Design an enzyme around this catalytic site. Structure first.
Site, PDB file in Angstrom:
ATOM      1  N   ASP A 121      78.347  36.284   1.996  1.00 20.93           N
ATOM      2  CA  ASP A 121      79.565  35.584   1.591  1.00 20.93           C
ATOM      3  C   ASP A 121      80.781  36.493   1.466  1.00 20.93           C
ATOM      4  O   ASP A 121      81.867  36.165   1.938  1.00 20.93           O
ATOM      5  CB  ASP A 121      79.348  34.861   0.267  1.00 20.93           C
ATOM      6  CG  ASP A 121      78.342  33.737   0.373  1.00 20.93           C
ATOM      7  OD1 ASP A 121      77.682  33.601   1.423  1.00 20.93           O
ATOM      8  OD2 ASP A 121      78.197  32.980  -0.605  1.00 20.93           O
TER       9      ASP A 121
HETATM   10  N1  LIG Z   1      79.137  38.470  -8.739  1.00 20.34           N
HETATM   11  C1  LIG Z   1      79.737  37.429  -9.367  1.00 20.34           C
HETATM   12  O1  LIG Z   1      80.621  37.516 -10.211  1.00 20.34           O
HETATM   13  C2  LIG Z   1      79.232  36.109  -8.962  1.00 20.34           C
HETATM   14  C3  LIG Z   1      79.426  35.689  -7.609  1.00 20.34           C
HETATM   15  N2  LIG Z   1      78.948  34.427  -7.173  1.00 20.34           N
HETATM   16  C4  LIG Z   1      79.129  33.946  -5.734  1.00 20.34           C
HETATM   17  O2  LIG Z   1      77.907  34.518  -5.127  1.00 20.34           O
HETATM   18  C5  LIG Z   1      78.364  35.009  -3.829  1.00 20.34           C
HETATM   19  C6  LIG Z   1      78.311  36.508  -3.580  1.00 20.34           C
HETATM   20  O3  LIG Z   1      78.094  37.090  -2.307  1.00 20.34           O
HETATM   21  P1  LIG Z   1      77.472  38.415  -1.810  1.00 20.34           P
HETATM   22  O4  LIG Z   1      77.335  39.357  -2.923  1.00 20.34           O
HETATM   23  O5  LIG Z   1      77.833  38.926  -0.486  1.00 20.34           O
HETATM   24  O6  LIG Z   1      75.985  37.629  -1.920  1.00 20.34           O
HETATM   25  P2  LIG Z   1      75.488  36.456  -0.950  1.00 20.34           P
HETATM   26  O7  LIG Z   1      75.339  35.297  -1.861  1.00 20.34           O
HETATM   27  O8  LIG Z   1      76.288  36.385   0.297  1.00 20.34           O
HETATM   28  O9  LIG Z   1      74.073  36.986  -0.500  1.00 20.34           O
HETATM   29  C7  LIG Z   1      73.726  38.113   0.235  1.00 20.34           C
HETATM   30  C8  LIG Z   1      72.437  38.285   0.968  1.00 20.34           C
HETATM   31  O10 LIG Z   1      71.387  39.074   0.352  1.00 20.34           O
HETATM   32  C9  LIG Z   1      70.236  38.832   1.272  1.00 20.34           C
HETATM   33  N3  LIG Z   1      69.016  39.449   0.481  1.00 20.34           N
HETATM   34  C10 LIG Z   1      68.498  38.987  -0.732  1.00 20.34           C
HETATM   35  N4  LIG Z   1      67.488  39.735  -1.110  1.00 20.34           N
HETATM   36  C11 LIG Z   1      67.296  40.715  -0.178  1.00 20.34           C
HETATM   37  C12 LIG Z   1      66.437  41.835   0.084  1.00 20.34           C
HETATM   38  N5  LIG Z   1      65.448  42.151  -0.775  1.00 20.34           N
HETATM   39  N6  LIG Z   1      66.621  42.585   1.206  1.00 20.34           N
HETATM   40  C13 LIG Z   1      67.610  42.315   2.124  1.00 20.34           C
HETATM   41  N7  LIG Z   1      68.470  41.301   2.001  1.00 20.34           N
HETATM   42  C14 LIG Z   1      68.320  40.531   0.895  1.00 20.34           C
HETATM   43  C15 LIG Z   1      70.294  37.391   1.551  1.00 20.34           C
HETATM   44  O11 LIG Z   1      69.622  37.108   2.697  1.00 20.34           O
HETATM   45  P3  LIG Z   1      68.211  37.190   3.427  1.00 20.34           P
HETATM   46  O12 LIG Z   1      67.283  36.169   2.846  1.00 20.34           O
HETATM   47  O13 LIG Z   1      68.581  36.957   4.828  1.00 20.34           O
HETATM   48  O14 LIG Z   1      67.734  38.525   3.231  1.00 20.34           O
HETATM   49  C16 LIG Z   1      71.701  37.080   1.335  1.00 20.34           C
HETATM   50  O15 LIG Z   1      72.312  36.468   2.532  1.00 20.34           O
HETATM   51  C17 LIG Z   1      79.737  34.430  -3.442  1.00 20.34           C
HETATM   52  O16 LIG Z   1      79.776  33.116  -2.807  1.00 20.34           O
HETATM   53  C18 LIG Z   1      80.336  34.444  -4.882  1.00 20.34           C
HETATM   54  O17 LIG Z   1      81.483  33.719  -5.126  1.00 20.34           O
HETATM   55  C19 LIG Z   1      78.274  33.631  -8.175  1.00 20.34           C
HETATM   56  C20 LIG Z   1      78.082  34.028  -9.487  1.00 20.34           C
HETATM   57  C21 LIG Z   1      78.554  35.267  -9.904  1.00 20.34           C
END
Ligand SMILES: NC(=O)C1=CN([C@@H]2O[C@H](COP(=O)(O)OP(=O)(O)OC[C@H]3O[C@@H](n4cnc5c(N)ncnc54)[C@H](OP(=O)(O)O)[C@@H]3O)[C@@H](O)[C@H]2O)C=CC1
Ligand SMILES: NC(=O)c1ccc[n+]([C@@H]2O[C@H](COP(=O)([O-])OP(=O)(O)OC[C@H]3O[C@@H](n4cnc5c(N)ncnc54)[C@H](O)[C@@H]3O)[C@@H](O)[C@H]2O)c1
Ligand SMILES: NC(=O)c1ccc[n+]([C@@H]2O[C@H](COP(=O)([O-])OP(=O)(O)OC[C@H]3O[C@@H](n4cnc5c(N)ncnc54)[C@H](O)[C@@H]3O)[C@@H](O)[C@H]2O)c1
Ligand SMILES: OC[C@H]1O[C@@](CO)(O[C@H]2O[C@H](CO)[C@@H](O)[C@H](O)[C@H]2O)[C@@H](O)[C@@H]1O
Ligand SMILES: OC[C@H]1O[C@@](CO)(O[C@H]2O[C@H](CO)[C@@H](O)[C@H](O)[C@H]2O)[C@@H](O)[C@@H]1O
Ligand code: NA
EC number: 7.1.1.1
Lengths: 359, 174, 363
Positions: free
Chosen positions: B103
């Site tokens: 994201d």
């Molecule tokens: N930080 C904050 O303040 C908060 C933010 N948010 C929201 O959450 C989002 C944040 O985005 P971003 O940080 O980029 O996170 P994302 O939500 O885009 O997620 C990132 C990716 O991590 C991958 N992943 C998970 N576990 C593993 C692993 N063990 N190894 C490799 N890959 C992994 C996933 O895919 P895959 O299964 O393909 O591996 C996933 O696509 C935004 O939409 C934001 O607005 C919500 C609440 C709080």
């Protein structure tokens, strides 16, 4: 075009609704910044600081306001029934941005409406994504989480981290966080980075993954055993930070007296939900209560305990929610009525109560 | 459809780059790769490679989520930058190591006003010579929106676990 | 062999000079342990925590000292002058182990001597590599460097770590710790744990390679020279959010590291933590036992910092005494005899069997 930030008069509030950076951003957008002298001294921001950014300085909540087009405040203004009248200080028909506890304070909502003012209840920001930039709930409840530990650590004899010393070994402190939210998570994090063996619990098991992602360790008729598995952990816990808060309702009980008695003496409990009941019936808003050998810390306005850092944030949360509307060049405001935020925020505009929930 | 690579391909790509910008996301946190990550960052820095971490205001699931872990991994606060200081760079960096993030990189949120992230700022990663994504599957993030970047002529995927992959890349580089 | 630990009576002392783990070891050495009701109730050590280890509980100090051959305490006993005369409770001709604070408290040394009381001043353990497991000073000024940071953050109006958030980026605190001793070293540790940016300085440069090893940075020169250095220190104290001072000197007054001049030059909201406060403090405004605000800065100077960590410190004070008295215990005749040739019993003893065997101000 005047934007004015008064000073916090509500008891215990030490945050201001502005920052030197925010000033320049407003100043740049064709605004005139006005703040009453020493309105941010409690937040380590001095008059000098402002005036260098471009802000002019007033002498009274009044002489600050007068013809204030839009006003900035951290805590909802005070009705006269409270002994001071700030609402009646706001030029009739101005724009009020602050956290109004809207859904709960009707008395105050009408006082504004009578002065025919548009009040934007910031604590109602839409749970969207573009909005996260303007969320006051999570920017403040974040530091709260941090503080919970800092305050819990302070009231604790034993040191947090595990230390190697010629006199032997000092074991770590065992923290246990209830409710895994913005607040809770920060707790867990800092708690662990300090050296504690952090462990959380939440009813939404969707959190087990967030907790684990912070090095934490999640805990696991259903509650017949869940509410019990907790016991086994609480009995060996030094700090118990509770942050469960379900709005418009008394916070749910996470730690009952019955439980604080079964705990290890010397331990401490931080009840951040102290104000909405407290997840522990012994927590009293304001001070530390001692019972069964346990200290039950229930402070108030915890973000104010981080007033310096929490302020420049609370400012942006605003500056953000605002600037989209400071029309390109006409140099005015323009609250796009359809704009998801505005139509989720505003409780009453030029006339009477507009928000749904109030009608 | 999309280009996919192996830990051997990333090793080469990065052992030979000049500037690199590590983009950490919830993924790395979930995997706890703050150490594999910093470990690697060093190897790069030993080859005269430029490294800097880009932190999206909401990367992670809590404010400063990438921070604690990056600190805990012992990462220099002068190598960690925020969105408004970093974006201006990508277009001058050979690689955009995006580990566990989605994201926070989606360009949709600058385009089609229908998307659930529209309006949100993002890290202009698609400006770096070549972009790499180190996630597991092709799934999306919180916004559950498909990331248009996965299918670009400068985007290679590096499927694996945030940690297990970085460890294999460091391994390959050595 | 009757060993007895009593509850501390001096005001503001929560530490006890005993742990249950130790009572368990002392009985082992063939001792009979006696503690007076909730002596460490302030260290979270419960009486039935000790009755379980084997120690006996006494209703009163006076009773829990009557028939004791060795006597373990945290702070120097109370003289008949001060108020209640504790000395008179220790069996004439007996052993006293505790932080006597002898080098600056003759009144207690004299009043003890007259009882044929042999007293070892623990704060006088010689700085030798093998004495470390028995040094109370270190196993306390360590918890102190920890607490420094904690009380430092508690009085600080900001947050310590760096957090990049949707509402902007909250920057890290910037500690400055003068004195890289036992406490200064932990001050740095605890400080970086909280994500802060640590700055430290010391005279003894053997320190530097240690500061950098925990993560901080040493305030250095760019290349009389005495002040070219002291000047830079200010270049950093203007940026500082918390100043932790721990610089001491054995003997008398604590050096001055922060002159009210410099306090005036600090950022509003800054907080100073003077650990040497009870020796004048490395900062003159450090009034003891109170936070003091001046020039928009908090000068936090608590007293007896180790007590602020009661529960943790006590167990360590009691493990130090143990590591010092254990050698001098014959195994089978379950009897004790303090060595003499032992550098340890040498530079620590301030008075024995009627006379002042120490070369301090009586040698
Ligand atoms: N930080 C904050 O303040 C908060 C933010 N948010 C929201 O959450 C989002 C944040 O985005 P971003 O940080 O980029 O996170 P994302 O939500 O885009 O997620 C990132 C990716 O991590 C991958 N992943 C998970 N576990 C593993 C692993 N063990 N190894 C490799 N890959 C992994 C996933 O895919 P895959 O299964 O393909 O591996 C996933 O696509 C935004 O939409 C934001 O607005 C919500 C609440 C709080
Ligand atoms: N956009 C979406 O998909 C969407 C929709 C709704 C909610 N949310 C989530 O709402 C959350 C709420 O914020 P918060 O935790 O800072 O605020 P809050 O006041 O809701 O926090 C209370 C919390 O502790 C936990 N808890 C423990 N016992 C509880 C109980 N009896 N009832 C309710 N909660 C209990 C919850 O998990 C909850 O977050 C955010 O973290 C957000 O991710 C997201
Ligand atoms: N018993 C032992 O074997 C034992 C136990 C612990 C530590 N040590 C050693 O003792 C030393 C540290 O001190 P401590 O805590 O024991 O004693 P201390 O309390 O005297 O130490 C604090 C520090 O203040 C510094 N200082 C004093 N005046 C200063 C000034 N004007 N400017 C800058 N710095 C100033 C010193 O350099 C000193 O290290 C270290 O070298 C350590 O390894 C030995
Ligand atoms: O240890 C807690 C912390 O609070 C203070 C405040 O003066 O001490 C209070 O709480 C202690 C329990 O933890 C009591 O034993 C003590 O008597 C009481 O004043 C600080 O001294 C301490 O650091
Ligand atoms: O940030 C300081 C921190 O100290 C506390 C301790 O109770 O407040 C004290 O210091 C404040 C100045 O920063 C005073 O305004 C307050 O009245 C005083 O008790 C915490 O509340 C605060 O977080
Ligand atoms: Na800060």
């Amino acid at each position: 075009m005047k934007i004015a930030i008064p000073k916090e008069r509500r008891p215990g509030e030490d945050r201001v609704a502005i920052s030197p950076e925010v000033v320049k951003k407003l100043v740049g957008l064709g605004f005139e910044v006005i703040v009453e002298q020493g309105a941010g001294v409690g937040a380590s921001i001095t008059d000098d600081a402002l005036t260098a950014a471009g802000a002019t300085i007033a002498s009274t909540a009044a002489q600050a306001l007068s013809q204030a087009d839009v006003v900035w405040k951290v805590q909802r203004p005070m009705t006269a029934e409270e002994g001071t009248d700030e609402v009646a200080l706001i030029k009739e028909g101005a724009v009020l941005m602050c956290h109004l506890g809207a859904l709960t304070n009707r008395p105050v909502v009408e006082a504004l409406t009578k002065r025919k003012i548009t009040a934007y209840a910031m604590e109602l920001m839409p749970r969207i994504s573009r909005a996260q930039s303007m969320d006051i709930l999570s920017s403040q409840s974040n530091l709260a989480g941090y503080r919970a530990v800092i305050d819990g650590a302070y009231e604790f004899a034993r040191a947090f981290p595990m230390m190697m010393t010629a006199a032997g070994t000092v074991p770590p402190a065992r923290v246990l966080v209830f409710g895994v939210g913005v607040a809770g998570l920060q707790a867990i994090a800092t708690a662990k980075r300090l050296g504690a063996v952090v462990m959380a619990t939440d009813v939404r098991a969707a959190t087990k993954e967030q907790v684990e992602s912070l090095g934490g360790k999640f805990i696991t008729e259903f509650r017949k055993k869940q509410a019990e598995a907790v016991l086994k952990e609480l009995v060996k816990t030094d700090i118990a930070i509770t942050t469960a808060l379900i709005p418009g309702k008394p916070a749910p009980v996470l730690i009952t007296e019955e439980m604080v008695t079964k705990m290890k003496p010397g331990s401490v409990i931080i009840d951040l939900a102290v104000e909405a009941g407290g997840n522990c019936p012994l927590s009293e808003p304001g001070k530390i209560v001692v019972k069964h050998g346990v200290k039950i810390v229930g402070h108030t306005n915890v973000p104010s305990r981080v007033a310096a850092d929490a302020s420049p944030l609370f400012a942006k949360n605003l500056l953000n929610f605002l600037t989209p509307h400071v029309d390109k060049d006409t140099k005015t405001l323009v609250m796009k009525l359809e704009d998801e935020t505005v139509s989720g925020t505003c409780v009453t505009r030029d006339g009477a109560i507009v928000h749904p929930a109030l009608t | 459809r999309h280009m996919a690579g192996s830990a051997e391909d990333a090793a080469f790509i990065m052992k030979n780059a000049s500037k690199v910008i590590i983009v950490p996301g919830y993924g790395m946190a979930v995997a706890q790769a703050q150490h594999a990550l910093r470990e690697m960052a060093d190897v790069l820095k030993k080859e005269g490679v430029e490294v800097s971490y880009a932190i999206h205001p909401v990367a992670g699931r809590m404010p400063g989520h990438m921070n604690v872990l990056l600190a805990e991994a012992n990462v220099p606060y002068d190598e960690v930058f925020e969105l408004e200081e970093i974006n201006s760079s990508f277009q001058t960096a050979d690689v955009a190591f995006v580990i566990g993030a989605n994201d926070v990189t989606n360009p949709a949120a600058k385009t089609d006003p229908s998307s659930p992230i529209y309006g949100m700022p993002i890290l202009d990663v698609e400006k770096a010579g070549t972009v790499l994504f180190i996630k597991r599957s092709m799934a999306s993030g919180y916004a559950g929106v498909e990331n248009e970047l996965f299918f670009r002529n400068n985007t290679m995927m590096l499927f694996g676990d945030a940690k297990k992959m970085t460890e294999q890349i460091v391994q390959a580089m050595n």
